[PDB]
Design a binder for this molecule. Sequence first.
Ligand SMILES: C=C1/C(=C\C=C2/CCC[C@]3(C)[C@@H]([C@H](C)CCCC(C)(C)O)CC[C@@H]23)C[C@@H](O)C[C@@H]1O
Length: 250
Amino acid sequence: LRPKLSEEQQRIIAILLDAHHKTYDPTYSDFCQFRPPVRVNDGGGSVTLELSQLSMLPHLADLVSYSIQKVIGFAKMIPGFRDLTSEDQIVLLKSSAIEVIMLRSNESFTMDDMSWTCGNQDYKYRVSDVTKAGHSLELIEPLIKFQVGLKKLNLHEEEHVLLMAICIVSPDRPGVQDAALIEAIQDRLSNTLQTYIRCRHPPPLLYAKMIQKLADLRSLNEEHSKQYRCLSFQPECSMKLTPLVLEVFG
Ligand SMILES: C=C1/C(=C\C=C2/CCC[C@]3(C)[C@@H]([C@H](C)CCCC(C)(C)O)CC[C@@H]23)C[C@@H](O)C[C@@H]1O
């Protein structure tokens, strides 16, 4: 059976599309306001050199900080999110922040050359740029594989926004108080996504493949946390980050 989308489900999708359009600028016009990207010579991928310079960290920290602000705005518009206690809201935002950033970045990712292209060459991010920010291949390679796999699903924008919303409103995040309420909110979003796929997604499993990407994100979250810890050990590193980044990942 392929039941039609209820009026409420249609409304939820409309609200989420609007939220995304207001919080994700496809022209990347604000990027010139971030601290400039600096790319030192490191063809050898020297960990020692990368840590001593962290040349790309200020720019990426600013990009991520900016993105967390946009994610906060997006989350506030998810139907039901405001009904949660502020304590639960913050817990969900802090624990999903890096995951939603990885998801939303798929919009700028291109399989032409496996990079995140955000306008001019100055804002094109490749694997080598991430290593210049202090991260290792243990995170980057799996990150790229994730991007390609998500790209191949060819999600409708409707599916893309629902997935980011479901990622944020997850009842199994450590620290949540009212798991039952959170689960109710997520179920409403999940049922909307499942109904949309059966009804609006033409042939040629997609729902299952999407749920699996959420599990993949948990692993990337874990690895990023481990690497952020190592990064924080570097003297003078805090100055290369931002107060928001320090709080969310610290
Ligand atoms: C941000 C956005 C973009 C790209 C995401 C990328 C490319 C560069 C490296 C990033 C920022 C990854 C880094 C592993 C995260 C490092 C962060 C830190 C230095 C604090 O540990 C995660 C997602 C990656 C651009 C645009 O799509 C908006 C989006 O919102």
